[PDB]
């Protein structure tokens, strides 16, 4: 590990600096180094890890979608052959994306999840496992595609089960998990009705619990509730 010689606290500090500088690849490398110190992560540290990799993989996904669209158009009837280059470059971006997902999943499996006993940490990591298997599923086409989808589903389901037992329905981790699992159902599992049902039930159960919250918690929860409503509007 290229970060093995740097203090854990220095890695965390530099991750925060990298975030301010919008250097998300650096931020992800620093947080990977911090995880590899072997200690559990605090809530703030978990969010630095997730922000870093979400931005890295989000850029890769956006690029993959552009290239996939060009490739599909190059393969339509009447298109002029342009050679192997579009496929090759889409494959290059795809392989880099898969590498990032494998890296995150590797951190979760060695050993973040197994040491995470509190609901806030364990649900957060299982949500991340579902998300990164979901990103693998977006690009998957081979013998293992169904197993990739099922790995995402299984991680999301375990996170959901814990969240329903241990967290209030307005907890922002629980809300974001449900938002993302609902998107998994719509876009990956070809289950739009399940996606819509989950988003609606999540929104309504959160609504009914808002009365318990402070102003700041209310803002956190209603932000994610608005995303649930945005998706419901897109889908209905």
């Amino acid at each position: 590990g290229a970060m093995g010689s740097m203090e854990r606290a220095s890695l965390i500090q530099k991750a925060k600096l990298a975030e301010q500088a919008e250097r998300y690849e650096d931020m992800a490398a620093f947080m990977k180094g911090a995880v590899e110190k072997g200690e559990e992560l605090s809530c703030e540290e978990r969010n630095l890890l997730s922000v870093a990799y979400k931005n890295v993989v989000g850029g890769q996904r956006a690029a993959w979608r552009v290239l996939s669209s060009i490739e599909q158009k190059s393969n339509e009837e009447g298109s002029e052959e342009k050679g192997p280059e579009v496929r090759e470059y889409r494959e290059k971006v795809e392989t880099e994306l898969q590498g990032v997902c494998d890296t995150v999943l590797g951190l979760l499996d060695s050993h973040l999840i197994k040491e995470a006993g509190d609901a806030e940490s364990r649900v957060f990591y299982l949500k991340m496992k579902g998300d990164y298997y979901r990103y693998l599923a977006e690009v998957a086409t081979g013998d293992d595609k169904k197993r990739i989808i099922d790995s995402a589903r299984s991680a999301y389901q375990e996170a959901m089960d814990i969240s329903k037992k241990e967290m209030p329905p307005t907890n922002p981790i629980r809300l974001g998990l449900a938002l993302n699992f609902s998107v998994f159902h719509y876009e990956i599992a070809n289950s739009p009705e399940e996606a819509i049902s989950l988003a609606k039930t999540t929104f309504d159960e959160a609504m009914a619990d808002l009365h318990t919250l402070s102003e700041d918690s209310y803002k956190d929860s209603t932000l994610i509730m608005q995303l649930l409503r945005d998706n419901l509007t897109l889908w209905t």
């Binding site: 998300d131 938002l179 993302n180 998107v183 719509y186 994610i224």
Partner: peptide, 5 residues
């Protein structure tokens, strides 16, 4: 695309 966090 739909929203995720």
């Amino acid at each position: 695309f739909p929203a995720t966090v």
